[PDB]
Design a protein around this ligand. Structure first.
Ligand SMILES: Nc1c2c([n+](CCCCCCCCCC[n+]3c4c(c(N)c5ccccc53)CCC4)c3ccccc13)CCC2
Ligand SMILES: Nc1c2c([n+](CCCCCCCCCC[n+]3c4c(c(N)c5ccccc53)CCC4)c3ccccc13)CCC2
Ligand SMILES: Nc1c2c([n+](CCCCCCCCCC[n+]3c4c(c(N)c5ccccc53)CCC4)c3ccccc13)CCC2
Lengths: 51, 51, 51
């Protein structure tokens, strides 16, 4: 079941341990990833005449 | 608050437990979604033929 | 580790708690945010008709 001992016990093989409480930092990075996309839209204007 | 007894209470309908579990995986799905969106640019090009 | 004492005790300043139960939700908000990006493609070309 869910308990303090279970969280500390998960430290045996490290793989789920790191991914369980360090994903949130990576989460913020995935946000701005959509923001940068907007500059891309100007390329559509050039897509008609091509490079 | 939350504890061993609190989580086990949701084991009968576990409706919310399904959502409160695996959320991390869902974000990963939304990570590849942003790249796929780029292909949509082709949709705009044909707007020149329509009204 | 984790315990109902750590969560409730955290309510003394509630400063980090706000960051612990608001940013998680922000992910879902960022979902629709990426879908909204598509209109930009149309808006990119519309500039040739309107300033
Ligand atoms: N030697 C091993 C063991 C185990 N693994 C499986 C993974 C065990 C670690 C993850 C445990 C996380 C528990 C929390 C997840 N969790 C949460 C919540 C619930 N309501 C949950 C309900 C049921 C289960 C988990 C829940 C609500 C919020 C979270 C191994 C895997 C690889 C190698 C060796 C392993 C299992 C036993 C031995
Ligand atoms: N898979 C994991 C999970 C979890 N954990 C525990 C995460 C706990 C985060 C809070 C730590 C900062 C506390 C700041 C609050 N806090 C405290 C105190 C003060 N005097 C403060 C003063 C000012 C501000 C805050 C203060 C005194 C005592 C606390 C893991 C830990 C390691 C590895 C894997 C983990 C949890 C779920 C999964
Ligand atoms: N017929 C039903 C009954 C009951 N249920 C249970 C109600 C749901 C309880 C969920 C517990 C949430 C606790 C959140 C604690 N928690 C956490 C974190 C924070 N940052 C927090 C900040 C503030 C407060 C709590 C916090 C960060 C991590 C946790 C049902 C549920 C679904 C369907 C039918 C149900 C009960 C009786 C009948």
């Amino acid at each position: 079941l869910l308990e303090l001992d279970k969280w500390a016990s998960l430290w045996n093989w490290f793989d789920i341990t790191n991914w369980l409480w360090y994903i949130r930092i990576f989460i913020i990075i995935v946000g701005s990833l959509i923001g940068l996309r907007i500059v891309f839209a100007v390329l559509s204007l050039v897509n008609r005449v091509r490079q």
